[PDB]
């Protein structure tokens, strides 16, 4: 029984945005912490078949060379609007000469996450992380389809996020380190994943006031995993 | 300004340019290329206002590519010269126009050899030999002296030789490098590179 | 013009377009093709032919560029408008940057255009999944595939179409390096997994490939029946 | 032969052809069937 | 409009366009006509029934000409048929602008089965109820063209359409022949108009039109009450 | 002036039964010629030309949107067209450009498809027709032609007559021209067949 | 404003496309053609839909539609968007030979077509093109021609083609009576009498019903040749001849 | 180009010469400035020939459709109100000097139009070049209420004085002359000049000619 796709609810929500919340849940799972020493993140990639070249699938892409991100479920309608965001902050480099800072990246966003109608079409389905280290210090930032964006000193997403928030709550607090946090995060990850952690299966990235952009090449990964 | 000459023969086609890159006063480039391969067996110089002359190159040569990308043949020369001529003929009667002078130089399997001329009116015509610019009035009296329709391809290069004795005998420019092509059954073939040495 | 969204998210967390037009993909031809390190090798079963008529204008193998390759699955009218404007765009990074056009950004392409196309007020999602093999700078061989939803996915060979599970289980007890160290082997190992695949009469068996410096040779149902023949001098040999 | 006739036969297909190809073989009081029979049982079942 | 633009026309699960085939019932439930080529000239004739004693018979006509020498009934609705008409006159004018001579009435029947067929196809709109009958004297040889509301056309010798036409259908092909003259040509119009009307048929229950190579003539209720002297 | 710019003329003249066109060869750049072999003259379906004079690129561009309407009419409607249809085909082609005007004067010179009628007109750059019964001229060299067809002309001509007092006027009016020179081609067309003479002109 | 509409785009839950389908089913009714290339020309063939004893005959054409000097095409489905479809194909071949006067290469114009009917399949509800076509012509580069359009925007060369649902059965024949490139223009018009023989059940043929045009190569004319009845006529004589000397086996 | 229109006791006698002068040299000796509109309405133009031939053609045009879609005659205030607005729309660069004449239901009336827009009822009117002197010779020979013999001979007089005087005028004068039922269209009214017939025959013989390259193609 197909109604108009710009209706609210018998109990007030809408019903379109609420089903893009649900259809976040069968994405992949994703961790980024805030810590004062620089932001760390973490993903799981979901390897499927051996025949499937691994160092092709992106979960971690770059919008500014301060600004990290992560996206979640469908992958290209997160690929439209990292190329946006993009192109935004570009747009604020220049007009300004100045970078423009996360929250002021994610207004921009979620100015258009919910523009979706049928004149001047449907929601976006994917969440996102949001980091990068502004004058405010280090940021973690998140992100929905409803527009609903939020600070976030260590959200976990997608389809492992209860667990992965209620441990992540039992092991965070306030004056973690970097690497300690790193590890913390990759326990979750092979915790909540279904296939053995090995070099092929996460991506870290972690951005610093001191190591400034972020960098993660393969094997460090390795000095990472075999420290476990 | 300069010219670039096209001599036809029976079954090939002697096209010819500088390598002069004209400024306010001063010689910028004395190694410039006005050679724009459209396809296998066509070829594209091109000389007029010069802002134009580049981007008639990426018309044109980027549809043929389309063409014979799709439908899986090379054009005729004919056709695509004619082409130009309606882009040309367009682009004439609008706010924006092009100003470029060059004739087009291809070859057929079964038509042969072709040779075409433009202007900066967007006239199609087909010439035994052709010509533009200053060059033109100094060099068409010794090519319509010694020509023949059936002459091989070494004598026409005696001859382009003896065009070239004259370009650098009564002119006030300098024109030190010339660069020569040919077109053949086989495709193009670059010829050696026809400068004089000055001192 | 025609204000309406066609694709709804489901109530349980779909798009009901994209993930059913891969059901057009599910049933229509199918089509493998690997990389080996120095030749590139493709081609598509089941032509399903009358095997008495013309065969040049079934061809679904094609190219956008002298680098760039073709194979799709799904309907052939949708592949039909994806090429035509896949060869505008890859022709028109031409006119700009002067390099040959890299694989990875024609496949980016085809992927933003059919994930705008899915995104757009009341178009119809492609149903079509492709293949684009082809070789840039420095000869690296790679290969990626397509979806309706739009991802570019790098893989090392191919499963679509039609009973793509048996064709990549084979795969996976085929993995073998040893597989693409003869040219020759890998060409007969395409042959051998399409010989895996459908009736394999070595009529529908339409292959192509690319030697990474030359342009796509289509090659002629002689040489591919002596390609078949000693692959059957090869299986009994395994007795 | 008859596998390549008809791209989308059924066992309903062939069970018709294989039955009236017979009732071609006992309107001419034989036993065995022709290759004849097939024609007609095929241009009887599918196009008709 | 609105930007819904979407065809309420559909196939059928077996494949038949519904909304033409009941566009063809409603053009088959209304007034009866008919309309004869006979090697001069092209005779169309209507059956025009007032429904009480009060009506006018001077303000509404059914022949109506589209040139000088072009002739147009039908057999539908006079709601759509007055607005297809006005969209044949427009376009007949354009033809005669660009290429300052008369329209040929095949050319007509091509550009106005072209609209019909287009509109048919467009977004939102049901198709005409209006099936037509164009004449004409064009080159010498005169002509008669039917169309129909689903976008067709043929070219008939002597046709009906309405009620019962199926009835006037076989009593033309017994009645007409290869040859005739106008006024027999009327004499068997008015006999297959009469098969199917009401028994008082009067100067103005009918309403014809004629055509002759020097141009087309409608015909008055003075000649047409002329007629009916020994009746169809 | 513009008109003068690549020279040009445009000759057709009525006989008896049968129409002769002429025009001249030379194509170039004001004072520089190019080639000898440049079309004017254009066919347009059977026993009926077209002839265009003036700017080179008008000639071409509405040779091909005249050709292009021309075949779209004629497949529109299977019989071939009737010249006065074509004249006020070309009246209108160009009159749509009214402000954009292109730089030609076209003479059109066919007989009639269904008697053996002969039929001339001219028309201006802006879509001005003009039919007369003995001969219309287009180009630079107007009143030359001008007065060799007032001079030689008679009602009533055999083809072999009109061909040489068309000859006789192309020759001698093209020679006292400047810049329209070097050859004349001449069609002489009847009911039964179609006749194309080059003429031995001054090449100077 | 959205309960009223129809949802002609949007694919069906059975797994293909739903009203495309039935396109399909509207073309398999009311038509019958194919064509017989097999060297120095082309033929079509056509069925007299409206054979009714009151039509006229006055167009000098039928089913035909020679939409340029050296292609035509026969129709089948909904006539009148087929004449929408002929006015645009015309036009797109013309406004090519002005864009580069040279004629019109047979598959390029095909695509064109293809690419008109599935911009209406694709995006928007509108109803789809309920016609299927042929082409017959010629080129520079392969000589003659066939082609099969769809509805969906499919296209395919043949050398022996069908539209119509009765002609099937015919495809069988041509494939039993199949040759090698054998088109004396007597054999293949004498295979494509026994075609239409057989597959209409109209017994015996009679030549009002029926329709044949060819397309040969002459070096300045490339005549199309849409010929009359008589020889029609003959060419049936010629047939039911022949098929009494074929019975003679029995 | 000079021409008149005057009014008599019952309808209009319009008037043209028909010398179609371009520049300096006399283009045509034999065209038609008198045009149709309707049955009973004609037009006559001056200045830009192409101009008035194609306006003509179009308001031609757009009074038969109105006229077929009435269903009776036209009227003249249409044709001036339609005229006087499509010229004015073009803010006068369409050169096209006219004169109206018709007969309605309220009689005659003659219309000039100014190629502005600027339009006049007047009882008689000259336009173009040489129409001083023909509108000397009305203001000379004018009274109200003429016959019509009187009335055609004074345009017949008013043109012919056009034609001895003006340089872009001279031919064959054509006449009209509409009344409420007998429309009338006379082209070689009074025919003036006469040519000499030739002194030399300069004939040419056959063969006095080199040809370089025959052609022959056959038909049906």
Known sequence: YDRGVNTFSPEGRLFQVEYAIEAIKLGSTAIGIQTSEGVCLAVEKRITSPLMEPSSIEKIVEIDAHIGCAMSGLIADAKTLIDKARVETQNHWFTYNETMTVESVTQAVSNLALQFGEEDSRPFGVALLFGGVDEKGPQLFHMDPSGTFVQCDARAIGSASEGAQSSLQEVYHKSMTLKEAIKSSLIILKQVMEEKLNATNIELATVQPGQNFHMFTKEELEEVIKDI | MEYLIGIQGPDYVLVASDRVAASNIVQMKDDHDKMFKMSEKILLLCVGEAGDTVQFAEYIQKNVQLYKMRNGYELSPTAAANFTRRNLADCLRSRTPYHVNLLLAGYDEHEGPALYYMDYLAALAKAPFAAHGYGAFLTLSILDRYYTPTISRERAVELLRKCLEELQKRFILNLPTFSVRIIDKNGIHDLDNISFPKQ | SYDRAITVFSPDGHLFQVEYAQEAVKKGSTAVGVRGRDIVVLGVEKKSVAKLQDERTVRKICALDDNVCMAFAGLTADARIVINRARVECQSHRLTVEDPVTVEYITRYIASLKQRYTQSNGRRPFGISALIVGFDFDGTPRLYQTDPSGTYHAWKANAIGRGAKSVREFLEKNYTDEAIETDDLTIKLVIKALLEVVQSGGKNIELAVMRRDQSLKILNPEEIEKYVAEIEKEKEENE | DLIMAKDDLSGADIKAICTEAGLMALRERRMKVTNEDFKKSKENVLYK | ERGYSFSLTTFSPSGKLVQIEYALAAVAGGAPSVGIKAANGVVLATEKKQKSILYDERSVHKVEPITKHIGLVYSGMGPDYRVLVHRARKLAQQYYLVYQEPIPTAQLVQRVASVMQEYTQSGGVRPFGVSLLICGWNEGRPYLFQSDPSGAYFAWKATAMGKNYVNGKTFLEKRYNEDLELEDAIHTAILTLKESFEGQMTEDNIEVGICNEAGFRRLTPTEVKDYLAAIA | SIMSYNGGAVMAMKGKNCVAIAADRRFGIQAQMVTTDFQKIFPMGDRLYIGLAGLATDVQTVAQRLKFRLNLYELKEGRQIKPYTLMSMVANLLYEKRFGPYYTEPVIAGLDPKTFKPFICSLDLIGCPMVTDDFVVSGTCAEQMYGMCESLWEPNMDPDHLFETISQAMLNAVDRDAVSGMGVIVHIIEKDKITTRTLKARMD | ?250 | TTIAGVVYKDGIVLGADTRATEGMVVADKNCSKIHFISPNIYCCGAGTAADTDMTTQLISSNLELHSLSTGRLPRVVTANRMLKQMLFRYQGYIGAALVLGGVDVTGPHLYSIYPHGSTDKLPYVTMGSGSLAAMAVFEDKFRPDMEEEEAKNLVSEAIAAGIFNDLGSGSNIDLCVISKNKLDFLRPYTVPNKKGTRLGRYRCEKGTTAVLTEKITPLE
């Open chain 7, 1 to 250: 404003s959205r309960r009223y509409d129809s949802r002609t785009t949007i694919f069906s839950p059975e797994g293909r496309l739903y009203q495309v389908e039935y396109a399909m089913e509207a073309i398999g009714h009311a038509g019958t053609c194919l064509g017989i290339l097999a060297n120095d020309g082309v033929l079509l063939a056509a069925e007299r839909r409206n054979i009714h004893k009151l039509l006229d005959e006055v167009f000098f054409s039928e089913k035909i539609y020679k939409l340029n000097e050296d292609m035509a095409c026969s129709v089948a489905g909904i006539t009148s968007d087929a004449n929408v479809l002929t006015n645009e194909l015309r036009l797109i071949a013309q406004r090519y030979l002005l864009q580069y006067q040279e004629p019109i290469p047979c598959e390029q114009l095909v695509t064109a077509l293809c690419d008109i009917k599935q911009a209406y399949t694709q995006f928007g509800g509108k109803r789809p093109f309920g016609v299927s076509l042929l082409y017959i012509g010629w080129d520079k580069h392969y000589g003659f021609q066939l082609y099969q359009s769809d509805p969906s925007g499919n296209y395919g060369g043949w050398k022996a083609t069908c539209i119509g649902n009765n002609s099937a059965a015919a495809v069988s024949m041509l494939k039993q009576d199949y040759k090698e490139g054998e088109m004396t223009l007597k054999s293949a018009l004498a295979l494509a009498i026994k075609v239409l023989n057989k597959t209409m059940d109209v017994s015996k043929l009679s030549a009002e019903k029926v329709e044949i045009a060819t397309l040969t190569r002459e070096n300045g004319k490339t005549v199309i040749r849409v010929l009359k009845q008589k020889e029609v006529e003959q060419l049936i004589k010629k047939h039911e001849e022949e098929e009494a000397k074929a019975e003679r086996e029995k």
